[PDB]
Amino acid sequence: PHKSSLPEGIRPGTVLRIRGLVPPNASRFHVNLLCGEEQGSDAALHFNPRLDTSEVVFNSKEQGSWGREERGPGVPFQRGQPFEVLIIASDDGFKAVVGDAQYHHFRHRLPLARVRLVEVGGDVQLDSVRIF
């Protein structure tokens, strides 16, 4: 579980660039924007590519409960292939970019100002996480 602590927060114009590879027998992996360091902290954003079920799920988590799922179009990821993801924060939500194209827009459910941590986990080879 790869963590990038952001205890002073993030603001609109923050761009997360994630570079890595999906391993050849991957089931699923995720990128979480969390609101604290404690176990079970709220997730302003949960970005969850699922190779095992061929979908990409977006959701939030508040007081331990998952919200309503949104899905992107198809699955722009492949077992055994490298990827590049941007997650962009704006005033109204998060924009996900995969490879050469924008993939999905996720409107804020929690205030952006609550985000304090980026966490990447699951079946993923993480080569770099940059936060511009």
Side-chain angles (χ1 to χ4, degrees):
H2 313 254
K3 295 188 182 190
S4 300
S5 183
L6 291 170
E8 303 293 336
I10 53 166
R11 317 178 32 233
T14 298
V15 174
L16 289 71
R17 180 158 75 190
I18 301 172
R19 290 179 169 160
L21 183 139
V22 184
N25 308 292
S27 290
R28 48 184 60 186
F29 72 96
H30 54 267
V31 179
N32 292 337
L33 298 186
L34 306 169
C35 299
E37 300 280 352
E38 311 87 343
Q39 297 183 74
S41 294
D42 295 344
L45 175 71
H46 172 70
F47 171 78
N48 185 204
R50 302 178 177 183
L51 292 305
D52 49 17
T53 53
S54 275
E55 66 196 336
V56 181
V57 172
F58 294 72
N59 209 344
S60 56
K61 189 215 294 180
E62 296 184 67
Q63 293 281 26
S65 59
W66 290 106
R68 61 151 181 103
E69 293 180 332
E70 305 179 14
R71 285 166 163 76
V75 188
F77 298 90
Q78 176 181 343
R79 287 170 176 134
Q81 303 292 322
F83 63 86
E84 176 180 63
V85 173
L86 309 182
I87 299 179
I88 305 156
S90 86
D91 287 318
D92 60 355
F94 305 100
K95 286 174 292 191
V97 183
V98 183
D100 311 344
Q102 184 177 340
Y103 178 64
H104 190 82
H105 174 77
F106 186 87
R107 293 193 185 247
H108 292 311
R109 303 177 179 181
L110 294 166
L112 174 60
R114 285 191 66 207
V115 172
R116 297 287 183 268
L117 166 75
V118 181
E119 168 181 286
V120 180
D123 308 327
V124 59
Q125 176 179 316
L126 188 57
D127 291 318
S128 57
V129 181
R130 303 272 180 275
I131 310 173
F132 301 114

